[PDB]
Amino acid sequence: QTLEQHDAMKYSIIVAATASEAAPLQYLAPFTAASIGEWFRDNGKHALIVYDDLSKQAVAYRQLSLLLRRPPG
Amino acid sequence: QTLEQHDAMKYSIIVAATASEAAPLQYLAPFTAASIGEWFRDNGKHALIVYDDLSKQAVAYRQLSLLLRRPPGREAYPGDVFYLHSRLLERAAKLSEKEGSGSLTALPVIETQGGDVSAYIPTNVISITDGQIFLEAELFYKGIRP
Amino acid sequence: QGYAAEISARRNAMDNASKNAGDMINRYSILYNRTRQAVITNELVDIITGASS
Amino acid sequence: PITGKVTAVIGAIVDVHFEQSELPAILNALEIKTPQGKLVLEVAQHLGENTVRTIAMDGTEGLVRGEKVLDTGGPISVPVGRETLGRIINVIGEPIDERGPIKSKLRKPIHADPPSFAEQSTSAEILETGIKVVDLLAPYARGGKIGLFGGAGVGKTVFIQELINNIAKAHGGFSVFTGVGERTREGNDLYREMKETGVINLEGESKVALVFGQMNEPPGARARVALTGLTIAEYFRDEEGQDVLLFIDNIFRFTQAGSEVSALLGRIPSAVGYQPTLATDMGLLQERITTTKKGSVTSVQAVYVPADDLTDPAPATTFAHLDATTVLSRGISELGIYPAVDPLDSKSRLLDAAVVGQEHYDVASKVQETLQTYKSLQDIIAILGMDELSEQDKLTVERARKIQRFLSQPFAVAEVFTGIPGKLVRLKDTVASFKAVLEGKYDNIPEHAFYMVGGIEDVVAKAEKLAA
Amino acid sequence: STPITGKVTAVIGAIVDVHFEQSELPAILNALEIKTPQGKLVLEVAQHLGENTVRTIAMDGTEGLVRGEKVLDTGGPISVPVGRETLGRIINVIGEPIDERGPIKSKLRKPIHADPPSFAEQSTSAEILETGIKVVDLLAPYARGGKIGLFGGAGVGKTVFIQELINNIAKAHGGFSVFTGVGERTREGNDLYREMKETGVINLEGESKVALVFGQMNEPPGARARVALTGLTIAEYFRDEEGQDVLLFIDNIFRFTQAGSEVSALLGRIPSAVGYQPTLATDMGLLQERITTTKKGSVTSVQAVYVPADDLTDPAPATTFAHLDATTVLSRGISELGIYPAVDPLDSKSRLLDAAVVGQEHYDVASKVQETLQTYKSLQDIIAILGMDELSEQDKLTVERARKIQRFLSQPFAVAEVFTGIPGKLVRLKDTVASFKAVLEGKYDNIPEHAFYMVGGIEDVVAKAEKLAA
Amino acid sequence: AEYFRDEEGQDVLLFIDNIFRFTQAGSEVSALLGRIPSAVGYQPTLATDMGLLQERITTTKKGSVTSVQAVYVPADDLTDPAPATTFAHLDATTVLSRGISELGIYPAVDPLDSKSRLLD
Amino acid sequence: AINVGLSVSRVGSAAQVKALKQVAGSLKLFLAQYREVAAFAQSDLDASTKQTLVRGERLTQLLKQNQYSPL
């Protein structure tokens, strides 16, 4: 909404993977977004991507990793 | 090369297990070194055996145990590491005057990475030994080198 | 005159020290907390590897 | 529906093996007939081969492998409506208070999916109360999460009661006080107290509905009580379009109980000794709380710190979700100021220039600034002495002390104790008062004559009465 | 039918599994014996894993255990020898003599296990031990019935402390004793064995005043565990059937805790308290209850205890602190300062200290001491920063008496003639009470600090005032 | 390195940025491999593997391979097994902490955490 | 709200063209000169440190901006 008041929503993409949403959706959230960004990139065009916040992605993946018995750090 | 310069090789024996060489041979090097020392002891002669460092023997034995499936203990070291250190260190005995009074002397060494004394291995060695010759990092700086 | 300045001065110095030590109590408190949290996680993991094997 | 025999009873983890066709879906509610009442078990895995793995909501005792089980067809259904208010209900939606079966026209499941993207709080909203301190310096919002801090029995009860009272006047609304980690001795006292202060009436309808999750009921009954109160709130929001305020008790004991639920199911409890599915569970809980087009549930939640740490995983996950913090303390109460609110520790992320208009923000900044400057000055003003005050400096002292007293509400909940008629001071009227004090148009009115009054209107009276 | 044949199935260190035949029906706490070149390896059954297959702990070497080699079933726990003719001989963990003078004489035998005496059997203390060490005697004395514990780190003279008590107390009392060595070095055994042979506590004829039971650490972790159960059994025999007080001694009882921790993980029992056996409370509990005063004998143990990392807020010492009646705390610092022993004055505490049991005067004097030292320690902070001349005159005098008291803990020992070289002293309980009191009353602040350094009893304190003056 | 050392008879030199990566990837593959992860999370086959790589660029009589090995300190803990077993194969160090890098000090070498046996 | 004392840019540092070269050839190094003077002020009583101090204070005040209104 904030973007749509200031006239700028139409040149941005928003990807959502909320906290109510299942653990693989959050995990796969950054990798998918970057696929759209690469398509803009490889047409020689300039682009940007903000991955907010990757630490919560690390958490989303943690549950998966812990059940997959992969070492803890 | 320092020993050969100072002429200390004609009574010295060097037992070795370098890092590249296998974990079995790394475990086995203190215990095979013990025997060379014991021969002197038995005959009524004297020796002194430096076992530097035993903390890395524990890591050798850890690798060994976990890939034969012996459950990790406190800090991943197996629940019988103390038994290794105990059985080795006590072969630094003196004998009765029938046997000639020969004694193996031992100097074990524990190279500690953080300097934590609440780790399992450093504790384990302290009990076994009759004395401690604490060396500290700070005192190196202060101008006592070594 | 000197003795009065001295007793006044020690009040001033020692006040600034109360604040200086305080700034440092708060900094070592942040470390203390972080440090306890890591110990708890590292304790836990040892049990987990054991149960699992 | 389909029937099957209990094929395990390890811990409070009961697996039930069903006649071959299919198993219950996940999250469904199963009912066990036994001479221990009923035991409602909730499916949290499918082991395959028509077998399940469940968590318990009722103590696991008087079970035998071979007892017949029944599949309801979905989550545990709790009653909803306005015939359930002022009555205490446990996790299955049935009385603890023993006032006769708690039933209503409709029931709804404890687990629900959160509303669409379109139907979330998408623009700012303001939830008006009667307290000056909350409404100026931390504005309660609709679909807003405000995490309460401080202990119980120094003002905490008075604060909860007040807001329940304000809501009826403001909208016609309701509240549901949900107690997680509730002690049964304390629970009777809260229901009797809540009757006395006029927010629960022994004859028909009331305001707040009480949901208690005792500790002598398994970890799941502590966990699902939060969901049990939510369903009630939502019924008002969706089908009667009324705004609600949903309290939670301690969020440590929501965390404490969830760790057990994790560890037990097969999963690993690692997250510094707590569940790894913690964030995702708060995500489900606090994203069904929001402003829909017909109504809105707002949530006040309570933070309990594990050992005085704001750097732990459980405080941290909570602090991200929370949009304001209200900070009751005892120091304030001992200076005869009820609410117990700390205006120095009253903050919101919905206190902005564009969220409450420009005027509201800019008065709040000054009101904050006076009190901050008064504190800095006060350090050396006490030590140096109260006569080593500047002309400039004593201008800051004077303004602050006028503001400090003026905040107090002689409000209806704590009316008995001071003896002074109740007050509700609306958000617009809070802002307006603060404007005249800023320009010093009441520097003819003594400092102490701002004592126990609300809005601008109110302090006209006290000024006269002090002189008289 | 009970097979007398088992074939070994898995040697994985100390853990030895056996494959017994049809009908055996295994039972825990039995003893399996395997013929071996190193004698008879004893295995104490500590699990049956089902279908006639035990998982056992070894008490002897398994560096020569051959698989396929016949395993007899003996049944129950092993049986050691007890009597009065079992004194002043060195008895192995499997019950065999390593002092090599034919077999260890018998009348009767009992097993290394014993059930713990019931509530009805228990009875209170009424006798008061006097060690002859001035710090122990004033600020925490022991009483017969007690489970004394010598908590300290390393380098605080643990063996020497234990040695001192035998030099005095052991001769004195009318009873016999038992000395039990759990997991200790080959130097320490020999040091104990020579020193007390000479002192006549060990004699080649039986009916001595100590027993020796040496179990050592170059023997598998199970042996270190059941050296203790073996010595203890000699003491129960004294207590009940032969009706004599024992002044039991065990050394180091951490080797007993540490031993259980090693075979705990391997038996499948996942560690608890972080790196320790989950059965820590009950193994201790069983051990401690056997050592008590009942309807006849009073078996009052003195147990050495090792605090790891010099930190006593760690779970292994803390659990133990509860289990022991009359704790003392020792530390590196005090020992190095010249104050013998390294026992701390405020941290030596008994649950057997009452104001009536040790008498009112004694109690009042030891309390004054506890106060004066505690003021001294509060004042240390003030003295570091503020200086020593910004103390009140009452305070300055308390500093001064506390210094005199602090050096009044220092007494040399005979068995610490490897430190000072000045023989030991014997100090009577009444003499400690009277000389400390005198300092505190302000009538004996004419005496300097160094004349309380290196003294016995009262007579000594007077003698040292003269010597320094000249 | 071996090709230059032996065959071509040369004294070589060597730079590595970072050998922590070697250690860390091997820790990821170890669970899958059939191995029980040791204290912290690192692999149990760690010492043997690290030794071999640093003895494959050793001081031979045909060529002397001077190495500069950078191990990125994990989570600001330099006592952990990946940087610690590195010291075993070393005679000199110049230990760098971030704090001293940020204040405006390049090179970021701790002066109070450096030791050498190439100093006498 | 960015500290340039804690921020750095390695081989990512480039976005400075002539305009932003002349006017200051990186304002961040100078504002890590301010950090020193203000370190030991709370440095010199000499006009040099006080000139930097006076610049650094003015500059810190000048940064202050309003949220979601860029320039």
PDB file of N, CA and C in Angstrom, chain D residues 232-266:
ATOM      1  N   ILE D 232     -13.749 -17.487  19.595  1.00  0.00           N
ATOM      2  CA  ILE D 232     -14.784 -16.710  20.184  1.00  0.00           C
ATOM      3  C   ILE D 232     -14.805 -15.298  19.697  1.00  0.00           C
ATOM      4  N   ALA D 233     -13.606 -14.694  19.673  1.00  0.00           N
ATOM      5  CA  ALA D 233     -13.344 -13.302  19.265  1.00  0.00           C
ATOM      6  C   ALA D 233     -13.774 -13.077  17.791  1.00  0.00           C
ATOM      7  N   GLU D 234     -13.396 -14.061  16.930  1.00  0.00           N
ATOM      8  CA  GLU D 234     -13.535 -14.085  15.535  1.00  0.00           C
ATOM      9  C   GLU D 234     -14.965 -14.174  15.240  1.00  0.00           C
ATOM     10  N   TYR D 235     -15.785 -14.872  16.051  1.00  0.00           N
ATOM     11  CA  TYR D 235     -17.183 -15.001  15.729  1.00  0.00           C
ATOM     12  C   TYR D 235     -17.898 -13.653  15.712  1.00  0.00           C
ATOM     13  N   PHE D 236     -17.534 -12.777  16.681  1.00  0.00           N
ATOM     14  CA  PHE D 236     -17.933 -11.399  16.771  1.00  0.00           C
ATOM     15  C   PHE D 236     -17.436 -10.651  15.703  1.00  0.00           C
ATOM     16  N   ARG D 237     -16.180 -10.789  15.261  1.00  0.00           N
ATOM     17  CA  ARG D 237     -15.628 -10.049  14.193  1.00  0.00           C
ATOM     18  C   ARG D 237     -16.271 -10.355  12.861  1.00  0.00           C
ATOM     19  N   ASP D 238     -16.299 -11.619  12.458  1.00  0.00           N
ATOM     20  CA  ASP D 238     -16.834 -12.077  11.143  1.00  0.00           C
ATOM     21  C   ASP D 238     -18.313 -12.001  10.929  1.00  0.00           C
ATOM     22  N   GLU D 239     -19.090 -12.403  11.987  1.00  0.00           N
ATOM     23  CA  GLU D 239     -20.552 -12.500  11.855  1.00  0.00           C
ATOM     24  C   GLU D 239     -21.317 -11.583  12.699  1.00  0.00           C
ATOM     25  N   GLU D 240     -20.644 -10.712  13.491  1.00  0.00           N
ATOM     26  CA  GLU D 240     -21.456  -9.702  14.177  1.00  0.00           C
ATOM     27  C   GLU D 240     -20.719  -8.314  14.009  1.00  0.00           C
ATOM     28  N   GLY D 241     -19.566  -8.268  13.285  1.00  0.00           N
ATOM     29  CA  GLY D 241     -18.739  -7.088  13.013  1.00  0.00           C
ATOM     30  C   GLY D 241     -18.342  -6.264  14.237  1.00  0.00           C
ATOM     31  N   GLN D 242     -17.955  -6.916  15.414  1.00  0.00           N
ATOM     32  CA  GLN D 242     -17.599  -6.205  16.616  1.00  0.00           C
ATOM     33  C   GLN D 242     -16.104  -6.439  16.837  1.00  0.00           C
ATOM     34  N   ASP D 243     -15.490  -5.316  17.364  1.00  0.00           N
ATOM     35  CA  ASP D 243     -14.033  -5.290  17.774  1.00  0.00           C
ATOM     36  C   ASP D 243     -13.909  -5.903  19.193  1.00  0.00           C
ATOM     37  N   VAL D 244     -12.771  -6.629  19.379  1.00  0.00           N
ATOM     38  CA  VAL D 244     -12.515  -7.550  20.515  1.00  0.00           C
ATOM     39  C   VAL D 244     -11.084  -7.208  20.988  1.00  0.00           C
ATOM     40  N   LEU D 245     -10.662  -7.716  22.184  1.00  0.00           N
ATOM     41  CA  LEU D 245      -9.327  -7.567  22.738  1.00  0.00           C
ATOM     42  C   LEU D 245      -9.006  -8.767  23.445  1.00  0.00           C
ATOM     43  N   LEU D 246      -7.907  -9.392  22.998  1.00  0.00           N
ATOM     44  CA  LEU D 246      -7.713 -10.760  23.333  1.00  0.00           C
ATOM     45  C   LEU D 246      -6.460 -10.738  24.103  1.00  0.00           C
ATOM     46  N   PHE D 247      -6.475 -11.165  25.412  1.00  0.00           N
ATOM     47  CA  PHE D 247      -5.323 -11.184  26.219  1.00  0.00           C
ATOM     48  C   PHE D 247      -4.728 -12.554  26.154  1.00  0.00           C
ATOM     49  N   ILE D 248      -3.442 -12.666  26.390  1.00  0.00           N
ATOM     50  CA  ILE D 248      -2.751 -13.885  26.657  1.00  0.00           C
ATOM     51  C   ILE D 248      -2.036 -13.583  27.955  1.00  0.00           C
ATOM     52  N   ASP D 249      -1.733 -14.582  28.758  1.00  0.00           N
ATOM     53  CA  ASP D 249      -0.943 -14.432  29.962  1.00  0.00           C
ATOM     54  C   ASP D 249       0.503 -14.449  29.535  1.00  0.00           C
ATOM     55  N   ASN D 250       1.283 -15.170  30.359  1.00  0.00           N
ATOM     56  CA  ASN D 250       2.658 -15.294  30.150  1.00  0.00           C
ATOM     57  C   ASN D 250       2.972 -16.021  28.788  1.00  0.00           C
ATOM     58  N   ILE D 251       3.968 -15.499  27.975  1.00  0.00           N
ATOM     59  CA  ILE D 251       4.240 -16.117  26.695  1.00  0.00           C
ATOM     60  C   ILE D 251       5.432 -17.022  26.881  1.00  0.00           C
ATOM     61  N   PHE D 252       6.072 -17.055  28.076  1.00  0.00           N
ATOM     62  CA  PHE D 252       7.028 -18.014  28.454  1.00  0.00           C
ATOM     63  C   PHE D 252       6.298 -19.321  28.581  1.00  0.00           C
ATOM     64  N   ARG D 253       5.107 -19.355  29.320  1.00  0.00           N
ATOM     65  CA  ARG D 253       4.529 -20.665  29.542  1.00  0.00           C
ATOM     66  C   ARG D 253       3.810 -21.160  28.289  1.00  0.00           C
ATOM     67  N   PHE D 254       3.474 -20.391  27.175  1.00  0.00           N
ATOM     68  CA  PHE D 254       3.092 -20.870  25.830  1.00  0.00           C
ATOM     69  C   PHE D 254       4.357 -21.543  25.245  1.00  0.00           C
ATOM     70  N   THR D 255       5.546 -20.972  25.389  1.00  0.00           N
ATOM     71  CA  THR D 255       6.759 -21.483  24.838  1.00  0.00           C
ATOM     72  C   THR D 255       7.067 -22.784  25.532  1.00  0.00           C
ATOM     73  N   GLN D 256       6.999 -22.879  26.936  1.00  0.00           N
ATOM     74  CA  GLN D 256       7.377 -24.000  27.786  1.00  0.00           C
ATOM     75  C   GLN D 256       6.659 -25.260  27.497  1.00  0.00           C
ATOM     76  N   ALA D 257       5.359 -25.036  27.327  1.00  0.00           N
ATOM     77  CA  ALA D 257       4.445 -26.141  26.949  1.00  0.00           C
ATOM     78  C   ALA D 257       4.713 -26.601  25.517  1.00  0.00           C
ATOM     79  N   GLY D 258       4.913 -25.702  24.493  1.00  0.00           N
ATOM     80  CA  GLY D 258       5.139 -26.091  23.092  1.00  0.00           C
ATOM     81  C   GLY D 258       6.396 -26.922  22.977  1.00  0.00           C
ATOM     82  N   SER D 259       7.453 -26.747  23.818  1.00  0.00           N
ATOM     83  CA  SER D 259       8.688 -27.527  23.738  1.00  0.00           C
ATOM     84  C   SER D 259       8.477 -28.916  23.963  1.00  0.00           C
ATOM     85  N   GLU D 260       7.549 -29.234  24.924  1.00  0.00           N
ATOM     86  CA  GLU D 260       7.173 -30.589  25.315  1.00  0.00           C
ATOM     87  C   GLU D 260       6.405 -31.281  24.158  1.00  0.00           C
ATOM     88  N   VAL D 261       5.549 -30.556  23.466  1.00  0.00           N
ATOM     89  CA  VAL D 261       4.723 -31.030  22.361  1.00  0.00           C
ATOM     90  C   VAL D 261       5.561 -31.479  21.218  1.00  0.00           C
ATOM     91  N   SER D 262       6.664 -30.657  20.992  1.00  0.00           N
ATOM     92  CA  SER D 262       7.751 -30.998  19.979  1.00  0.00           C
ATOM     93  C   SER D 262       8.588 -32.167  20.226  1.00  0.00           C
ATOM     94  N   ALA D 263       9.074 -32.274  21.454  1.00  0.00           N
ATOM     95  CA  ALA D 263      10.051 -33.250  21.830  1.00  0.00           C
ATOM     96  C   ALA D 263       9.491 -34.679  21.828  1.00  0.00           C
ATOM     97  N   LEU D 264       8.214 -34.736  22.317  1.00  0.00           N
ATOM     98  CA  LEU D 264       7.373 -35.871  22.408  1.00  0.00           C
ATOM     99  C   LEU D 264       6.901 -36.506  21.077  1.00  0.00           C
ATOM    100  N   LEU D 265       6.588 -35.707  20.045  1.00  0.00           N
ATOM    101  CA  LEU D 265       6.050 -36.182  18.799  1.00  0.00           C
ATOM    102  C   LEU D 265       7.088 -36.976  17.971  1.00  0.00           C
ATOM    103  N   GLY D 266       8.409 -36.914  18.255  1.00  0.00           N
ATOM    104  CA  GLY D 266       9.376 -37.558  17.462  1.00  0.00           C
ATOM    105  C   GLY D 266      10.403 -36.574  17.102  1.00  0.00           C
TER     106      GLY D 266
END
